[PDB]
């Protein structure tokens, strides 16, 4: 379905993803694993994700975000897809 642009593809490959084309659900799976494994989420309010100085901040263009902002996260992702 979707083809990540190169920076997002690099993030997905760092957690094991090997393909060029993914479903959105698989992009989301790998991105959650990226966040989890790099400990980017706040340990007390775990919907807060810190990304400034990680590749993810560059991708999204924000220094932090909340997981609860669903429409914003979809939008940011799709700016990194073709």
């Amino acid at each position: 379905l979707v083809r990540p642009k190169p920076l997002l593809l690099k993030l997905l490959k760092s957690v094991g993803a090997q393909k060029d084309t993914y479903t959105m659900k698989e992009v989301l799976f790998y991105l959650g694993q990226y966040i989890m494994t790099k400990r980017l989420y706040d340990e007390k309010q775990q919907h807060i994700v810190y990304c400034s100085n990680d590749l993810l901040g560059d991708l999204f263009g924000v220094p932090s975000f909340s997981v609860k902002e669903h429409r914003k996260i979809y939008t940011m992702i799709y700016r990194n897809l073709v």
Binding site: L28, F29, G32, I35, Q46, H47, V67, K68, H70, I73
Partner: peptide, 12 residues
């Protein structure tokens, strides 16, 4: 909720 529980909410 935990991170992955919020992320599930995002995915569903």
């Amino acid at each position: 909720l935990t991170f992955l529980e919020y992320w599930a909410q995002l995915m569903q």
